[PDB]
Nucleic acid binder design. Structure first.
Lengths: 106, 130, 181, 61, 170, 124
RNA sequence: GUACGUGAAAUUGCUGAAAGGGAAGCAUUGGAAAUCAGUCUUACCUGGGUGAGAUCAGUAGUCUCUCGAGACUAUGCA
RNA sequence: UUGAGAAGCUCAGACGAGUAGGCAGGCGUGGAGGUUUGUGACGAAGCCUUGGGCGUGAGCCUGGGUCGAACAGCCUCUAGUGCAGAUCUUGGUGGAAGUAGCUAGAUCUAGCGAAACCACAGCCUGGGGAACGGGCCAGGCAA
């Protein structure tokens, strides 16, 4: 099934935190192919989303999506800080986040 | 008197109640627990086995086995009362099951214990018409 | 690039450095399988590591490598417990993974990390005298698999040579060579 | 079944259903998100009955 | 009932006046573009002309079937494909009114709403197609001249493994 | 000026969960060595004047109206000129008889009733 | 239903639910299941016709006030 | 421009730990004079409830279920007025426990059945400076 995938895969690492205090308002996302702070500038502003399924059939479907937005880079390894409409659950650490290409600035 | 089960109206059921029975509460709870869900005739045979020491009631919550006869004797009349009340309604005897049983604490005057029992039926009707 | 299943060859790799990269990857919700763990290398000569084990009881380097990661992950945390099962350490290359690509970690390679003339120890050699008694059979499988793999490589090489000759013979190739393809 | 929409009253539904080809009309009044009254009329000018439902249990319950 | 009943403090004169929007350089009319969001995401579409915010764009109906539609510049990737002459088509008739959604109108008598016996269909008018067929008649001739352009619009944009949008300019 | 609150959750009393003789009503812990009174980490919060809400929004329901308790039908009449800011709360002991008189009057007056569907029942 | 007004908490039994590797416990952030919050184009303005009414009559009377200010009773609807 | 509860409305700036202690404004209970031409058998008071709200908070308003004869908001008057402790008083109730056992039968089985005690618990390893292990962090264990 070659095709689709107008987005770029990304992994949700953890929250913005000190050694012991965690602020779950913003989360660290490591986008594939992003390995420097200067490179992450391209992904600043994109719309990231978390896609998961559930048993309940809502509106005839089975998919619930929590949208978000990339805000700033995080370190020198291409990580980014993304704020979502609903803060991500703490169980989704090490999952997949889909960074679609809009709002495009290119 | 209002019982504790959503069934036990005139649908397929007959009741029976025990009030301030002079038996130890812990023994009645264990006796009630083991006989729940069994067939009425099966429960009668099992109670006989307890009297004849053929079978022993397990002691799970209030702890293994034991052979109480006084508590079983109290239950024998209630079950006999239960089927006597079933007959007055005119139910189908061979399919009676002990749908519900509950032992409650009584006033501390010896520790008595209220006992209730509910007998019912098991039924299934094939839909067919395919 | 990351995959659902990743096979990492442990030959010529430092234990601690290999443990670090897999520890981060395991917390990243990725399944990692490690093969040939007996051929891992630890800086420091053989006697020092032997004394280290004597002070220290699992004889399998696959267990030892797992044990090193186990204390290198939040084992108490239920997330760390779940991530532990996603890591599969096995000695040699089993058939379920022999016919698959085996990538390597640059940050753990001995040639890229160890100064020339520095003594090092091999876990499989180290484990041979501490309770492990399967070196011969493990080795015997290694040559058997590599001989079959080498024959497979020769067939693949011959196929590659034939298609390469066909590719060059194709006039389409140099029609639009301006793209660098 | 037709979900009531707009400012149309029951005396106007019955007239409309008379020419549409119906015989009787059932209304399930619901208030406070609990159904409590069923009123039914006989088309075109038959008697109307007004019952108050109780213990209405769905098939699931 | 016009004299203001309550205190009703009025909005203070806000010092905001609308100014023309500025679009990206590559968004010049006649540019192949990668549609990003909407039911027609992933197709390739040329830019007929610009608008206030969006870009009035259509793909060849006889190739891709993309109708003239407002598409916001943000949901469009500006591709550096060789530019296509779009001067031929009459772009002036394309306005906000032309692309305006039909007003919530057409009241119905309060008997037909019941029984659900008034449902119309807003099926696309022919002149809307005839507008596009004219646009196709003015862009389809243009595009075949450029080699592989007609097929390029036909193809659907997608990403393979190891695709870095920043590295490979679109 | 929208209805925004500095906090949703209520202030529960410290250790009010453990005991049942201890009521959930907030009581200031006066314990001399009380570390929870001392504002340590992992403890509970404590009411402060810093938690007050906007003075143009205090007493305002989430839809912007301030609840106003009307006993009888006389009270619902004086909300004639504040119907855009106040909502006629019907007292809890007002009988179903006067409860309809209050709701029908308030509907025509233009004011919003908060508990207009209590103890009553519609009929068509 | 005389173990009798209301029948709280502790406490106990039954059932349903989820959870249950030497605690539990609570706090933040969510998720999930379960459940409530509240929904509303509809009115306004404008146009005409049709019948009206009156606080309007190029109109007639009574009542209480202070000429005209009310409440009305006729009569016509410009 | 309507913004005179002048005890009002409005504008500006800085500031905000807290024991002993000092000052101020409030919330709540019983009853008392005034008042709401107040509420109430079309359901008062009370009670429970993962119903909805309000207040920083003390507290308050309301929906549902029970309930059945009284009750409340406001201004003042007044006091036997606010509880988690007192090895507190009284009543109730558990674990302990079907235990210690005591009345039979053949150690077991029936039958009859306490008191003491009880913040809550219960793997250690070390370090954790003040014991720290019984809770804290590193650890293993943990089924």
């Amino acid at each position: 099934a070659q095709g689709h995938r107008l987005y770029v895969k990304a992994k949700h690492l953890s929250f913005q935190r000190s050694k012991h205090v965690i602020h779950p308002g913003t989360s660290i996302v490591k986008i594939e192919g992003c390995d420097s702070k200067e490179e992450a500038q391209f992904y600043l502003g994109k719309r990231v989303c978390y896609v998961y399924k559930s048993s309940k059939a809502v509106r005839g479907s089975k998919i619930r999506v929590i949208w978000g937005t990339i805000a700033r880079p995080h370190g020198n390894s291409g990580a980014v800080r993304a704020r979502f409409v609903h803060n991500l659950p703490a169980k989704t650490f090490g999952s997949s986040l889909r960074v679609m290409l809009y709002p495009s600035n290119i | 008197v209002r019982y504790s089960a959503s069934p036990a109206l005139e649908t397929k059921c007959a009741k029976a109640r025990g009030a301030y029975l002079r038996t130890h509460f812990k023994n009645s709870r264990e006796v009630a627990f083991t006989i729940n869900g069994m067939s009425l005739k099966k429960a009668f045979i099992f109670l006989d086995n307890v009297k004849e020491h053929k079978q022993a009631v397990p002691f799970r919550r209030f702890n293994q086995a034991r052979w109480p006869v006084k508590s079983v004797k109290f239950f024998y009349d209630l079950l006999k009362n239960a089927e006597a009340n079933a007959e007055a309604k005119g139910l189908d005897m061979d399919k009676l099951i002990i749908k519900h049983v509950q032992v409650n604490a009584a006033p501390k005057q010896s520790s008595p214990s209220h006992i209730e029992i509910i007998v019912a039926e098991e039924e299934e009707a094939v839909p067919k018409a395919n | 690039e990351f995959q659902k299943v990743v096979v990492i060859d442990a030959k010529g790799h430092l234990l601690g450095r290999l443990a670090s990269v897999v520890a981060k990857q395991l917390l990243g919700g990725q399944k990692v399988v490690v093969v040939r763990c007996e051929e891992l290398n630890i800086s420091g000569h053989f006697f020092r590591n032997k004394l280290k084990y004597l002070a220290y009881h699992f004889r399998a380097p696959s267990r030892i490598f797992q044990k090193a990661v186990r204390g290198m992950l939040p084992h108490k945390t239920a997330r760390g417990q779940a991530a532990l099962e996603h890591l599969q350490a096995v000695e040699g290359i089993p058939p379920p993974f022999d016919k698959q690509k085996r990538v390597v970690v640059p940050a753990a390679l001995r040639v890229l990390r160890l100064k020339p003339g520095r003594k090092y120890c091999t876990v499989g050699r180290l484990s041979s005298e501490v309770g492990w008694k399967y070196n011969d059979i493990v080795a015997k499988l290694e040559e058997r698999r590599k001989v079959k793999s080498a024959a497979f490589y020769q067939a693949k090489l011959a196929k590659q040579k034939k298609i390469a000759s066909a590719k060059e013979a194709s006039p389409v190739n140099q029609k639009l060579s301006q793209f660098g393809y | 079944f037709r979900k009531r929409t707009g400012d149309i009253e029951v005396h106007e539904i019955a007239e409309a259903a008379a020419k549409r080809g119906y015989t009787d009309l059932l209304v399930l009044n619901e208030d406070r998100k609990k159904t409590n009254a069923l009123t039914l009329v006989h088309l075109p000018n038959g008697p109307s009955f007004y019952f108050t439902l109780s213990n209405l249990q769905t098939a699931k319950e | 009932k016009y004299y203001p009943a309550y205190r009703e403090n009025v909005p203070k004169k806000a010092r905001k006046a609308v100014r023309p929007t500025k679009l990206r350089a590559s968004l010049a009319p006649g540019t192949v573009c990668i549609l990003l969001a909407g039911r027609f995401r992933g197709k390739r579409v040329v830019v007929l002309s610009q608008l206030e915010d969006t870009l009035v764009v259509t793909g060849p109906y006889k190739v891709n079937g993309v109708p003239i539609r407002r598409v916001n510049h943000r949901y469009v990737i500006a591709t550096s494909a060789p530019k296509i002459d779009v001067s031929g088509v009459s772009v002036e008739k394309f306005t906000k009114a032309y692309f305006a959604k039909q007003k919530r109108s057409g009241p119905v008598k309060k008997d037909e709403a019941f029984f659900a016996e008034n449902a119309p269909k807003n099926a696309l008018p022919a002149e809307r197609i005839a507008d596009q067929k004219a646009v196709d008649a003015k862009l389809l001739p243009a595009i075949k001249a450029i080699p592989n352009m007609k097929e390029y619009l036909a193809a659907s944009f997608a990403l393979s493994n190891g695709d870095r949008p920043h590295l490979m300019k679109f | 000026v929208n209805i925004i609150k500095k906090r949703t959750k209520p202030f529960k009393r410290h250790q009010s969960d453990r005991f049942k003789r201890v009521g959930e009503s907030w009581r200031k812990p006066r314990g001399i060595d009380s570390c929870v009174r001392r504002r340590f980490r992992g403890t509970i919060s404590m009411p402060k004047i810093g938690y007050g809400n906007n003075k143009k929004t205090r007493y305002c329901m989430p839809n912007g109206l301030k609840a106003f308790l009307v006993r009888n039908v006389s009270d619902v009449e004086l909300l004639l000129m504040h119907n855009k800011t106040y909502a006629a709360e019907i007292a809890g002991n007002v009988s179903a008889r006067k409860r309809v008189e209050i709701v029908e009057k308030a509907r025509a007056l233009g004011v919003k009733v908060t508990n207009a569907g209590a103890k009553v029942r519609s009929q068509e």
